[PDB]
Amino acid sequence: AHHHHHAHAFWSTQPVPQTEDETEKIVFAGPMDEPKTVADIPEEPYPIASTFEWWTPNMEAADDIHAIYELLRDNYVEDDDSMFRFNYSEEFLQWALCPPNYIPDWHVAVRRKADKKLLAFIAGVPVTLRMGTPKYMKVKAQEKGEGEEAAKYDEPRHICEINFLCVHKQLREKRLAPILIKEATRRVNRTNVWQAVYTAGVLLPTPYASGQYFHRSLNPEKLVEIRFSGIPAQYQKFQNPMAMLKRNYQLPSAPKNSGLREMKPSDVPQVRRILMNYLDSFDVGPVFSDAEISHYLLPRDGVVFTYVVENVKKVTDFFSFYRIPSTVIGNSNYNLLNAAYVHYYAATSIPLHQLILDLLIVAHSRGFDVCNMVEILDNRSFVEQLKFGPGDGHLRYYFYNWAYPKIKPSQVALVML
Numbered sequence: 428a429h430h431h432h433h434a435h436a437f438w439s440t441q442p443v444p445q446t447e448d449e450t451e452k453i454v455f456a457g458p459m460d461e462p463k464t465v466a467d468i469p470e471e472p473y474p475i476a477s478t479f480e481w482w483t484p485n486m487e488a489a490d491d492i493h494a495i496y497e498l499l500r501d502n503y504v505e506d507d508d509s510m511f512r513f514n515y516s517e518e519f520l521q522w523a524l525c526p527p528n529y530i531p532d533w534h535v536a537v538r539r540k541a542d543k544k545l546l547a548f549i550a551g552v553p554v555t556l557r558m559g560t561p562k563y564m565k566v567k568a569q570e571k572g573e574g575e576e577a578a579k580y581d582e583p584r585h586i587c588e589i590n591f592l593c594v595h596k597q598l599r600e601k602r603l604a605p606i607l608i609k610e611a612t613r614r615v616n617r618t619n620v621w622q623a624v625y626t627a628g629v630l631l632p633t634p635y636a637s638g639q640y641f642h643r644s645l646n647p648e649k650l651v652e653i654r655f656s657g658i659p660a661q662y663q664k665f666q667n668p669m670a671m672l673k674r675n676y677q678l679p680s681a682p683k684n685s686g687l688r689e690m691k692p693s694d695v696p697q698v699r700r701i702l703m704n705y706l707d708s709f710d711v712g713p714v715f716s717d718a719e720i721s722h723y724l725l726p727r728d729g730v731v732f733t734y735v736v737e738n739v740k741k742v743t744d745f746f747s748f749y750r751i752p753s754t755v756i757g758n759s760n761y762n763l764l765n766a767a768y769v770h771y772y773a774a775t776s777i778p779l780h781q782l783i784l785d786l787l788i789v790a791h792s793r794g795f796d797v798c799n800m801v802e803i804l805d806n807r808s809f810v811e812q813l814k815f816g817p818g819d820g821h822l823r824y825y826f827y828n829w830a831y832p833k834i835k836p837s838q839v840a841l842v843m844l
């Protein structure tokens with residue numbers, strides 16, 4: 428019942444595969460660029476106009492995080508004609524940008540010298556990623572006798588995740604974005620890191636995986652009244668069509684699993700174990716320490732919500748979801764849309780659809796209006812029984828400086844904003 432509404436001067440110089448045809452022919456994982464060392468990377472920041480300066484924000488400082496908050500609030504807009512606007516609170520931004528061992532230098536900003544107004548931003552965070560040759564390719568490579576080349580890059584790699592690329596609207600379409608990407612590349616290279624991973628809605632050279640978005644209505648009445656959803660014509664036959672619509676997406680009001688409770692700090696080592704056990708099944712996936720599990724998964728009000736199944740003693744299952752609220756433009760009754768995004772999870776004692784059913788119940792009980800996700804992990808497996816519908820977006824996954832075969836999004840275990 429959803430409302431469906433839908434030459435590279437810089438990227439052709441970058442160490443990424445340049446065509447879909449190239450990517451579909453890659454058989455081994457490995458770097459694109461020729462080997463470099465840190466000393467081969469320019470010491471000085473990339474030149475920008477004299478009215479501007481590079482600035483590294485201190486995220487512990489109120490003024491700095493507020494400055495980044497305001498830039499993104501007013502300028503981090505994928506579509507000016509959308510009826511919605513994503514909102515990234517300072518707490519959200521600290522959670523996304525300041526994981527344990529984050530590198531301040533990788534938060535790259537441009538500001539105007541005279542008044543110190545922040546005009547552009549791009550952010551990298553460390554992540555440890557398994558990104559060696561997909562298991563099927565390695566298998567096929569072994570049958571041809573090339574197993575050790577296929578396995579050469581199997582060790583998890585300490586790399587960079589790039590997000591929150593943003594140019595102030597006054598500075599748009601002036602090639603500042605390539606400069607931001609070059610400066611981040613420079614700074615990351617100077618840390619002896621040579622690959623990055625990143626996601627985008629736009630199609631760039633060249634994704635290794637792409638996945639459709641899916642939505643699960645939690646407050647159908649509100650979703651229709653803001654035109655996120657429509658009430659289709661067959662409902663225009665029934666007696667109280669809106670009552671019929673609310674009945675169709677009705678959930679139980681209390682979760683089905685006993686032992687389900689909010690995650691607490693003492694759960695961290697066990698959640699790490701069952702998560703890692705699950706994520707290692709996928710060709711591309713992160714490796715998390717206890718500190719990273721704690722930072723990314725411990726409940727964080729207004730940002731991250733995480734529950735465990737602990738039916739006496741042992742943590743056997745868990746799920747998590749994070750919040751991004753959308754401003755609703757021009758609606759008399761509603762100003763905000765509260766969206767729950769499926770995060771990490773692991774099921775070992777109950778079917779996956781049963782665990783995610785409880786996610787929906789908990790998310791609904793916490794006032795969320797819609798539950799969103801991309802078809803990574805095993806998310807595709809419960810779409811139909813839990814009444815998710817596909818949206819119009821696609822999340823495209825890219826590597827920088829990494830030759831990588833084309834894979835399915837169900838082969839990807841890295842949750843990325």
Ligand SMILES: CCCCCCCCCCCCCC(=O)SCCNC(=O)CCNC(=O)[C@H](O)C(C)(C)COP(=O)(O)OP(=O)(O)OC[C@H]1O[C@@H](n2cnc3c(N)ncnc32)[C@H](O)[C@@H]1OP(=O)(O)O
Nearest residue numbers: 435436437438590591592593594599600601602603604621
């Ligand atoms: C080893 C370490 C490596 C580190 C770096 C790894 C790579 C990181 C890569 C970045 C990962 C980002 C992940 C996220 O955060 S995805 C979210 C992106 N941000 C937004 O959508 C916020 C709103 N939009 C904006 O702020 C601007 O429109 C941006 C900044 C996006 C472009 O600014 P502007 O509109 O003023 O344009 P320009 O004249 O300066 O530049 C035009 C050039 O920019 C290319 N472009 C456009 N959109 C994107 C995009 N989303 N990723 C990469 N490149 C993009 C475009 O194809 C063209 O290149 P080419 O077509 O001529 O070749």
Ligand SMILES: [Zn+2]
Nearest residue numbers: 430431432433
């Ligand atoms: Zn429309």
